[PDB]
């Protein structure tokens, strides 16, 4: 039903200084990889899940698209929880990752964990908006932060990157406290449902 590639982006900022929301934080994103990989690769073929980091310690590629979720779990290790944030770097790392992959000429999706409003440059996000539209790239923004962070340059990125209907962005707000991270992502359009074209 849905054939797409998933790219997990790890972005941190000064708003990420909280390390435990209910009993933990940033440790739930490790276990959520198993639920995302099982609901995509094991559910239907031609669905691959990669991992990159555009902020925190170093803006590098943690793990590329593989056939198992264990290699993605090794990429999440050795990652600074509090560090610098670069928005324009994470978008270019995924574009180079999605350029070389298996089963080309398909739909592409980027799943980014956004803990901060990400205020850097307005014109830089506009020039990078039309770049991802030509390759049919779907950038999904998940908000954690402190309660809800919106009505800023973060939401301006969603409206500026959308020429089509389902191929660009989906908003998901995670409520702090004892909440299931994989359940809010599964019920969201991020996993299967809409976005396929």
């Amino acid at each position: 039903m849905v054939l797409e590639a998933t790219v997990l982006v790890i972005d941190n900022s000064e708003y990420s200084r909280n390390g435990d929301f209910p009993r933990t934080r940033f440790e739930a994103q490790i276990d959520s990889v198993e639920f995302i990989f099982q609901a995509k690769r094991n559910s239907n073929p031609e669905n691959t899940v990669g991992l990159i980091s555009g902020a925190g310690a170093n803006p590098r590629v943690l793990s590329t698209f593989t056939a198992e979720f264990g290699k993605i779990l090794a990429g999440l290790h050795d990652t600074q929880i509090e560090g610098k944030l670069h928005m324009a770097t994470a978008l270019q790392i995924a574009q180079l990752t999605l350029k070389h992959r298996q089963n080309k000429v398909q739909h592409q999706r980027i799943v980014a964990f956004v803990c901060s409003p990400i205020s850097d440059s307005r014109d830089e996000l506009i020039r990078l908006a039309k770049t991802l539209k030509k390759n049919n790239v779907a950038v999904d923004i998940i908000n954690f932060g402190e309660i809800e962070q919106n009505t800023e340059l973060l939401d301006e990125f969603i409206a500026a990157v959308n020429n089509p209907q389902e191929e660009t962005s989906h908003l998901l707000t995670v409520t702090p406290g004892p909440r299931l991270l994989y359940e809010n992502i599964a019920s969201s359009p991020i996993i299967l449902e809409e976005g396929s074209s």
Binding site: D31, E34, E68, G70
Partner: protein
Amino acid sequence: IRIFRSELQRLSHENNVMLEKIKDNKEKIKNNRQLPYLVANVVEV
């Protein structure tokens, strides 16, 4: 039933990492050994 299943999945997956690692090693260790073994005697260890 709750915490044990979280750590069991990590050890079970790591056991599969060495499983695929030895799977190619089992094929090499058996094939690299020459089946027509020749009689020999070691004079000094």
